[PDB]
């Protein structure tokens, strides 16, 4: 039905689905009625049903209004169709080294709780068409590249259990990040260069440009990592912000160098400002070329 949310902070996603189980119970076979019997949902409490669970779920519920969102349909040969409408928050461990130019693999692991493969077997009914509605998923921040269906047996100390896996490949959309972080960082870095066109005697003006750009670049960095889990490694966006920091810090040190020499060596001081006007924009352009080639 939907994937409502994907959380990097909680490393999880929220899925709503119609979960259908089919099996044969010969105790429920009936004759003399050429119909499939749809029965009121409350009959599910009088039947055996599979003990299916989601091994990577954190919190799940069956929708309950106006009745429990459950269906039971019987067929003359004792085939049961049992349907539930479920919302699950499920764990998805994310690799954020390339964030926000990252691709994630989020799964739903389906298993028998207590019955081993001696008692129960699972299969995807319809094979690769067993899962529908992947086109309905509308995450502003992600596109679904691919989904896959897997079937296997998993061994624990209590025995071998049937497993089905549904997996999604989620490609992050860059657009939000261009607007929120990359463009602001680029505009602060450009602001830092204004200093090189200001008279070297304007010490208050040029130090103010230097301070404000250096400290704004620190606030952008610290703010960003408060949106993410407390990972010990560097992300792609951290690498960009650290590069921008080095540029704006060097623009201030350029003025410190000019201020230090312009009394004794006014011509050398003038030449350094002239050089900086070309070299800072050029070397920032190079930095951007290398960065966006490596990560795109």
């Amino acid at each position, epitope marked *: 039905a939907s994937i409502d949310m994907v959380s990097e902070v909680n490393m999880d996603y929220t899925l709503t689905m119609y979960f259908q189980q089919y099996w044969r119970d010969k105790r429920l076979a009936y004759s003399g009625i050429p119909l499939n019997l749809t029965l009121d949902n409350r009959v599910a409490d009088q039947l055996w049903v599979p003990d299916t669970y989601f091994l990577n779920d954190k919190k799940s519920f069956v929708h309950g209004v106006t009745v429990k969102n459950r269906m039971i349909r019987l067929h003359p040969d004792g085939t049961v169709l049992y349907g539930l409408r479920i919302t699950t928050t499920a764990a998805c461990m994310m690799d954020l080294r390339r964030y926000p130019l990252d691709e994630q693999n989020c799964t739903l692991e389906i298993e028998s709780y207590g019955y081993t493969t001696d008692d129960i077997e699972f299969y995807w009914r319809g094979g690769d068409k067993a899962v*529908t509605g*992947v*086109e*309905r*998923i*509308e995450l502003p921040q992600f*596109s*679904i590249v691919e989904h896959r269906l897997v079937s296997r047996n998993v061994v624990f100390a209590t025995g071998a259990y049937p497993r089905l896996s549904l997996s999604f490949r989620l490609k992050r959309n860059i657009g939000y990040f261009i607007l929120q972080t990359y463009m602001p960082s680029i505009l602060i870095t450009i602001l830092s260069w204004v200093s090189f066109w200001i008279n070297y005697d304007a010490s208050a003006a040029r130090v103010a440009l230097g301070i404000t750009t250096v400290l704004t670049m620190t606030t952008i960095n610290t703010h960003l990592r408060e949106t993410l889990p407390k990972i010990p490694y560097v992300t792609a966006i951290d690498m960009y912000l650290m590069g921008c920091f080095v540029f704006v810090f060097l623009a201030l040190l350029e003025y410190a160098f000019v201020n230090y020499i312009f009394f004794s060596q006014p011509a050398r001081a003038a030449a350094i400002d002239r050089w900086s006007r070309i070299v800072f924009p050029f070397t920032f352009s190079l930095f951007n070329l290398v960065y966006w080639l490596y990560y795109v």
Partner: nanobody, 108 residues
Framework: GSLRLSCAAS????????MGWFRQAPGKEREFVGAISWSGGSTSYADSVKDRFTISRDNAKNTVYLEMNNLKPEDTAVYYC??????????????????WGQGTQVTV
């Protein structure tokens, strides 16, 4: 021979995130070919045209295209385009779709 059918949309396309391609042979029922989401380009195909036809779109022009490669004499029908609402049911079922194109006749 290779062919490219195109399907150009206009109006409230936000409420109708899916475009479907159907085809109706003389006598037979209206039949699913494939469908594309406007946002994301999430694609689906009928088995018959799987690894032959390819659908995609461009949101700039508000246009969807069915690229009919590796054609066959079974591929002889009135091909229609249609839009599906967000909560309007399964992709495959033409009664779920609301806004139907004129319908191009194709013979080979």
């Amino acid at each position: 021979g290779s062919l490219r059918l195109s399907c150009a949309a206009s109006g409230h396309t936000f409420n109708y995130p899916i475009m479907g391609w159907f085809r109706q042979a003389p006598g037979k029922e209206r039949e699913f070919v494939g469908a594309i989401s406007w946002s994301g380009g999430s694609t689906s195909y009928a088995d018959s045209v799987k690894d032959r036809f390819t659908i995609s779109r461009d949101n700039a022009k508000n246009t969807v295209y069915l690229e009919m490669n590796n054609l066959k004499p079974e591929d002889t029908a009135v091909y229609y385009c249609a839009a599906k609402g967000r909560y309007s049911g399964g992709l495959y079922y033409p009664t779920n779709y609301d806004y139907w194109g004129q319908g191009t006749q194709v013979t080979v």
